[PDB]
Protein backbone atom coordinates (compact mmCIF):
# COMPACT_ATOMS: atom_id res chain seq x y z
CA UNK A 1 0.00 0.00 0.00
CA UNK A 2 1.79 3.10 -1.28
CA UNK A 3 -0.44 5.10 -3.73
CA UNK A 4 2.51 7.09 -5.16
CA UNK A 5 0.52 9.80 -6.95
CA UNK A 6 -0.28 11.52 -3.63
CA UNK A 7 3.46 12.09 -3.35
CA UNK A 8 4.37 13.03 -6.92
CA UNK A 9 5.28 16.57 -7.91
CA UNK A 10 2.88 18.18 -10.35
CA UNK A 11 4.77 20.11 -12.93
CA UNK A 12 4.70 21.96 -16.27
CA UNK A 13 6.88 22.86 -19.27
CA UNK A 14 8.04 26.29 -20.50
CA UNK A 15 9.23 26.78 -24.11
CA UNK A 16 11.76 29.29 -25.55
CA UNK A 17 11.23 32.52 -27.46
CA UNK A 18 11.37 32.20 -31.25
CA UNK A 19 8.01 30.43 -31.54
CA UNK A 20 4.36 30.77 -30.62
CA UNK A 21 2.92 29.88 -27.16
CA UNK A 22 5.59 29.05 -24.59
CA UNK A 23 3.42 26.74 -22.46
CA UNK A 24 3.46 23.19 -23.76
CA UNK A 25 2.29 20.55 -21.31
CA UNK A 26 2.54 18.76 -17.98
CA UNK A 27 4.94 16.23 -16.47
CA UNK A 28 5.52 14.83 -12.97
CA UNK A 29 8.85 14.43 -11.22
CA UNK A 30 9.02 13.58 -7.45
CA UNK A 31 8.82 15.10 -3.97
CA UNK A 32 11.95 17.16 -3.26
CA UNK A 33 13.72 15.82 -0.18
CA UNK A 34 17.20 15.88 1.22
CA UNK A 35 19.27 13.06 -0.38
CA UNK A 36 17.74 13.12 -3.92
CA UNK A 37 15.61 16.18 -4.26
CA UNK A 38 13.61 16.28 -7.48
CA UNK A 39 15.53 19.10 -9.21
CA UNK A 40 19.19 18.04 -9.30
CA UNK A 41 18.61 14.35 -10.06
CA UNK A 42 17.63 13.69 -13.67
CA UNK A 43 17.13 16.86 -15.83
CA UNK A 44 17.34 14.71 -18.97
CA UNK A 45 13.80 13.99 -20.12
CA UNK A 46 12.90 14.74 -23.75
CA UNK A 47 9.62 15.94 -25.24
CA UNK A 48 9.19 15.24 -28.95
CA UNK A 49 6.26 17.32 -30.20
CA UNK A 50 4.96 18.60 -33.54
CA UNK A 51 5.34 22.33 -34.05
CA UNK A 52 1.84 22.63 -35.54
CA UNK A 53 0.69 22.38 -31.92
CA UNK A 54 3.41 24.91 -31.12
CA UNK A 55 2.38 27.51 -33.73
CA UNK A 56 -1.31 26.95 -34.48
CA UNK A 57 -0.98 26.99 -38.26
CA UNK A 58 -1.75 23.78 -40.16
CA UNK A 59 0.80 23.96 -42.99
CA UNK A 60 3.32 22.28 -40.68
CA UNK A 61 1.58 19.03 -39.68
CA UNK A 62 4.90 17.19 -40.05
CA UNK A 63 8.28 18.36 -38.61
CA UNK A 64 8.21 17.36 -34.93
CA UNK A 65 10.60 19.07 -32.52
CA UNK A 66 12.56 17.12 -29.92
CA UNK A 67 13.42 19.14 -26.81
CA UNK A 68 16.24 19.03 -24.26
CA UNK A 69 15.75 19.96 -20.60
CA UNK A 70 18.28 22.35 -19.06
CA UNK A 71 17.45 24.65 -16.12
CA UNK A 72 14.48 24.93 -13.77
CA UNK A 73 13.22 27.51 -11.29
CA UNK A 74 10.30 26.35 -9.13
CA UNK A 75 7.74 24.86 -11.56
CA UNK A 76 9.39 26.94 -14.32
CA UNK A 77 11.62 24.80 -16.54
CA UNK A 78 13.13 26.03 -19.79
CA UNK A 79 14.12 23.72 -22.61
CA UNK A 80 16.61 23.54 -25.48
CA UNK A 81 16.26 22.15 -29.00
CA UNK A 82 17.24 18.51 -29.40
CA UNK A 83 16.45 17.41 -32.95
CA UNK A 84 14.04 17.64 -35.85
CA UNK A 85 11.82 14.67 -36.64
CA UNK A 86 9.52 13.73 -39.53
CA UNK A 87 6.23 11.83 -39.75
CA UNK A 88 6.02 8.16 -40.60
CA UNK A 89 3.18 8.19 -43.18
CA UNK A 90 4.47 10.98 -45.44
CA UNK A 91 7.88 9.43 -46.07
CA UNK A 92 5.87 6.27 -46.72
CA UNK A 93 3.67 8.45 -48.94
CA UNK A 94 6.15 10.64 -50.81
CA UNK A 95 8.16 7.77 -52.28
CA UNK A 96 6.25 7.19 -55.51
CA UNK A 97 6.84 4.40 -58.01
CA UNK A 98 8.90 5.16 -61.15
CA UNK A 99 10.90 8.08 -59.73
CA UNK A 100 14.33 8.82 -58.27
CA UNK A 101 15.21 8.92 -54.55
CA UNK A 102 18.05 11.26 -53.58
CA UNK A 103 19.40 11.70 -50.03
CA UNK A 104 22.35 13.55 -48.51
CA UNK A 105 24.00 14.37 -45.18
CA UNK A 106 26.95 16.28 -43.71
CA UNK A 107 28.46 16.94 -40.27
CA UNK A 108 29.50 20.47 -39.31
CA UNK A 109 30.43 22.76 -36.39
CA UNK A 110 28.50 25.96 -35.66
CA UNK A 111 29.32 29.36 -34.12
CA UNK A 112 29.15 28.02 -30.63
CA UNK A 113 30.54 24.53 -31.03
CA UNK A 114 27.29 22.64 -31.45
CA UNK A 115 28.09 19.85 -33.90
CA UNK A 116 25.11 18.60 -35.86
CA UNK A 117 24.63 16.02 -38.59
CA UNK A 118 21.97 17.45 -40.88
CA UNK A 119 20.00 15.27 -43.28
CA UNK A 120 18.50 16.20 -46.66
CA UNK A 121 16.08 14.23 -48.84
CA UNK A 122 15.33 15.03 -52.47
CA UNK A 123 12.71 13.68 -54.87
CA UNK A 124 12.24 14.31 -58.58
CA UNK A 125 9.05 15.60 -60.19
CA UNK A 126 7.42 15.19 -63.57
CA UNK A 127 6.53 18.03 -65.91
CA UNK A 128 3.69 19.16 -68.17
CA UNK A 129 3.26 17.33 -71.54
CA UNK A 130 5.62 14.51 -70.55
CA UNK A 131 5.06 11.50 -72.78
CA UNK A 132 6.94 8.72 -71.01
CA UNK A 133 5.81 7.29 -67.68
CA UNK A 134 9.02 7.20 -65.65
CA UNK A 135 11.30 10.28 -66.13
CA UNK A 136 14.27 9.15 -64.01
CA UNK A 137 17.60 10.91 -63.60
CA UNK A 138 20.82 10.01 -65.43
CA UNK A 139 23.03 9.08 -62.40
CA UNK A 140 25.57 11.76 -63.36
CA UNK A 141 23.09 14.51 -62.61
CA UNK A 142 22.78 12.84 -59.19
CA UNK A 143 26.54 13.00 -58.67
CA UNK A 144 26.27 16.71 -59.44
CA UNK A 145 23.06 17.50 -57.53
CA UNK A 146 24.31 15.77 -54.37
CA UNK A 147 27.44 17.90 -54.72
CA UNK A 148 25.55 21.15 -55.48
CA UNK A 149 23.44 20.79 -52.31
CA UNK A 150 26.56 20.25 -50.19
CA UNK A 151 28.05 23.75 -50.49
CA UNK A 152 24.60 25.27 -49.96
CA UNK A 153 24.40 23.43 -46.64
CA UNK A 154 27.78 24.74 -45.48
CA UNK A 155 27.23 28.38 -46.45
CA UNK A 156 24.01 28.43 -44.41
CA UNK A 157 25.51 26.90 -41.25
CA UNK A 158 28.41 27.96 -38.90
CA UNK A 159 26.86 31.41 -38.54
CA UNK A 160 24.44 32.57 -35.84
CA UNK A 161 23.16 29.29 -34.32
CA UNK A 162 19.68 27.85 -33.54
CA UNK A 163 18.14 31.20 -32.55
CA UNK A 164 18.51 32.02 -36.24
CA UNK A 165 19.18 28.53 -37.65
CA UNK A 166 15.92 26.91 -36.52
CA UNK A 167 14.29 30.17 -37.59
CA UNK A 168 15.69 29.51 -41.05
CA UNK A 169 14.36 25.95 -40.89
CA UNK A 170 10.73 26.85 -40.14
CA UNK A 171 9.75 28.65 -43.42
CA UNK A 172 12.10 26.23 -45.33
CA UNK A 173 14.02 29.02 -47.06
CA UNK A 174 17.02 26.67 -47.46
CA UNK A 175 14.93 24.15 -49.43
CA UNK A 176 14.03 26.92 -51.85
CA UNK A 177 17.71 27.87 -52.04
CA UNK A 178 18.38 24.28 -53.14
CA UNK A 179 15.66 24.74 -55.78
CA UNK A 180 17.30 27.97 -56.96
CA UNK A 181 20.47 26.05 -57.85
CA UNK A 182 19.04 22.66 -58.87
CA UNK A 183 16.92 24.22 -61.64
CA UNK A 184 19.85 24.38 -64.08
CA UNK A 185 20.17 20.56 -64.05
CA UNK A 186 16.81 18.87 -63.32
CA UNK A 187 14.22 20.79 -61.28
CA UNK A 188 12.74 18.60 -58.46
CA UNK A 189 9.76 18.05 -56.10
CA UNK A 190 9.00 18.29 -52.37
CA UNK A 191 12.62 18.48 -50.99
CA UNK A 192 12.95 18.57 -47.19
CA UNK A 193 15.77 18.10 -44.70
CA UNK A 194 13.53 15.74 -42.68
CA UNK A 195 15.96 15.19 -39.76
CA UNK A 196 18.62 16.86 -37.66
CA UNK A 197 20.47 15.63 -34.55
CA UNK A 198 22.91 16.93 -31.94
CA UNK A 199 25.92 15.06 -30.60
CA UNK A 200 28.62 17.45 -29.43
CA UNK A 201 27.26 20.31 -27.34
CA UNK A 202 30.31 21.80 -25.55
CA UNK A 203 29.05 23.22 -22.24
CA UNK A 204 25.95 24.43 -20.36
CA UNK A 205 26.18 28.25 -20.93
CA UNK A 206 23.13 29.27 -18.88
CA UNK A 207 23.83 32.99 -19.39
CA UNK A 208 23.57 32.89 -23.17
CA UNK A 209 20.70 30.42 -22.73
CA UNK A 210 18.82 33.21 -20.94
CA UNK A 211 18.97 35.36 -24.09
CA UNK A 212 15.84 33.59 -25.41
CA UNK A 213 13.98 34.36 -22.20
CA UNK A 214 11.62 37.15 -21.20
Amino acid sequence: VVDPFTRKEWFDIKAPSTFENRNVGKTLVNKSTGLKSASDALKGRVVEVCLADLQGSEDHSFRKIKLRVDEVQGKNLLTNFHGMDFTTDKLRSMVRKWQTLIEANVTVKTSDDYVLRIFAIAFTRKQANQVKRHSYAQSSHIRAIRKVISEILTKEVQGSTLAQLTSKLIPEVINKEIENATKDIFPLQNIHVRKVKLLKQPKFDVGALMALHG
Partner: protein, 109 residues
Protein backbone atom coordinates in the same frame (compact mmCIF):
# COMPACT_ATOMS: atom_id res chain seq x y z
CA UNK B 1 -7.15 24.15 -20.98
CA UNK B 2 -6.40 20.50 -20.23
CA UNK B 3 -3.67 18.35 -18.75
CA UNK B 4 -2.14 16.13 -21.43
CA UNK B 5 -0.13 12.94 -21.76
CA UNK B 6 0.48 10.13 -24.23
CA UNK B 7 -1.16 6.72 -23.99
CA UNK B 8 1.01 4.75 -26.47
CA UNK B 9 -1.02 1.59 -27.23
CA UNK B 10 1.27 -1.24 -28.35
CA UNK B 11 -1.03 -3.61 -30.26
CA UNK B 12 0.89 -6.85 -30.79
CA UNK B 13 -0.21 -10.39 -31.52
CA UNK B 14 -1.40 -12.75 -28.75
CA UNK B 15 -1.49 -9.76 -26.31
CA UNK B 16 -1.94 -6.00 -26.67
CA UNK B 17 -0.06 -3.48 -24.52
CA UNK B 18 -0.93 -0.02 -23.22
CA UNK B 19 0.95 2.37 -20.91
CA UNK B 20 -0.27 5.94 -20.49
CA UNK B 21 2.81 8.02 -19.73
CA UNK B 22 3.67 11.68 -19.34
CA UNK B 23 4.47 14.07 -22.20
CA UNK B 24 8.16 13.33 -21.67
CA UNK B 25 7.35 9.61 -21.80
CA UNK B 26 9.78 8.42 -19.12
CA UNK B 27 7.17 8.59 -16.33
CA UNK B 28 4.56 5.83 -16.64
CA UNK B 29 1.06 5.70 -15.08
CA UNK B 30 -1.35 2.77 -14.53
CA UNK B 31 -0.11 0.31 -17.14
CA UNK B 32 -2.34 -2.73 -16.67
CA UNK B 33 -2.70 -4.76 -19.86
CA UNK B 34 -5.34 -6.91 -21.53
CA UNK B 35 -4.05 -10.41 -20.77
CA UNK B 36 -4.25 -9.69 -17.04
CA UNK B 37 -8.06 -9.58 -16.92
CA UNK B 38 -8.60 -13.00 -18.52
CA UNK B 39 -7.31 -16.50 -17.72
CA UNK B 40 -7.65 -18.68 -20.82
CA UNK B 41 -4.32 -17.84 -22.58
CA UNK B 42 -6.23 -17.67 -25.88
CA UNK B 43 -8.12 -14.38 -25.49
CA UNK B 44 -5.19 -12.25 -24.27
CA UNK B 45 -5.55 -10.10 -27.41
CA UNK B 46 -9.33 -10.38 -27.85
CA UNK B 47 -11.29 -7.13 -28.37
CA UNK B 48 -13.76 -8.08 -25.61
CA UNK B 49 -10.99 -8.29 -23.01
CA UNK B 50 -9.46 -5.18 -24.59
CA UNK B 51 -12.56 -3.19 -23.65
CA UNK B 52 -12.36 -4.41 -20.05
CA UNK B 53 -8.71 -3.48 -19.48
CA UNK B 54 -8.99 -0.09 -21.20
CA UNK B 55 -11.98 0.77 -19.01
CA UNK B 56 -9.84 0.02 -15.95
CA UNK B 57 -6.97 2.11 -17.33
CA UNK B 58 -9.38 4.98 -17.97
CA UNK B 59 -10.66 4.54 -14.40
CA UNK B 60 -7.23 4.97 -12.83
CA UNK B 61 -6.36 7.85 -15.17
CA UNK B 62 -8.99 10.34 -14.01
CA UNK B 63 -8.51 9.13 -10.42
CA UNK B 64 -5.11 10.87 -10.45
CA UNK B 65 -6.23 14.07 -12.15
CA UNK B 66 -5.29 13.44 -15.78
CA UNK B 67 -8.13 14.51 -18.08
CA UNK B 68 -6.77 14.54 -21.65
CA UNK B 69 -4.27 12.40 -23.52
CA UNK B 70 -2.94 11.53 -26.97
CA UNK B 71 -1.93 8.07 -28.22
CA UNK B 72 0.79 6.61 -30.44
CA UNK B 73 -0.35 3.24 -31.81
CA UNK B 74 2.36 0.64 -32.40
CA UNK B 75 2.36 -2.80 -34.01
CA UNK B 76 5.28 -5.20 -33.66
CA UNK B 77 7.20 -4.09 -36.75
CA UNK B 78 10.84 -4.60 -37.66
CA UNK B 79 10.96 -8.07 -39.20
CA UNK B 80 7.48 -8.90 -37.91
CA UNK B 81 3.84 -8.81 -38.94
CA UNK B 82 3.81 -4.94 -39.30
CA UNK B 83 0.04 -4.80 -38.71
CA UNK B 84 -1.97 -3.59 -35.67
CA UNK B 85 -3.91 -6.10 -33.61
CA UNK B 86 -7.65 -6.62 -33.12
CA UNK B 87 -8.08 -4.91 -29.78
CA UNK B 88 -6.01 -1.88 -30.74
CA UNK B 89 -9.25 -0.51 -32.08
CA UNK B 90 -11.05 -1.85 -29.01
CA UNK B 91 -8.56 -0.20 -26.66
CA UNK B 92 -9.06 3.12 -28.46
CA UNK B 93 -12.84 2.63 -28.51
CA UNK B 94 -13.19 1.87 -24.80
CA UNK B 95 -11.24 4.87 -23.49
CA UNK B 96 -12.95 7.29 -25.89
CA UNK B 97 -16.34 5.96 -24.75
CA UNK B 98 -15.19 6.42 -21.13
CA UNK B 99 -15.17 10.18 -21.71
CA UNK B 100 -11.54 11.12 -22.25
CA UNK B 101 -10.24 13.63 -24.79
CA UNK B 102 -8.48 12.73 -28.04
CA UNK B 103 -6.47 14.85 -30.45
CA UNK B 104 -3.93 14.31 -33.26
CA UNK B 105 -2.87 10.68 -32.77
CA UNK B 106 -0.12 8.94 -34.74
CA UNK B 107 1.74 5.73 -35.50
CA UNK B 108 5.10 4.65 -34.09
CA UNK B 109 5.48 1.30 -35.88
Amino acid sequence: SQVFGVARIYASFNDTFVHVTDLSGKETIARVTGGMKVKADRDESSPYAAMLAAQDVAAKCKEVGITAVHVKIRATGGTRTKTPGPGGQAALRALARSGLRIGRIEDVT
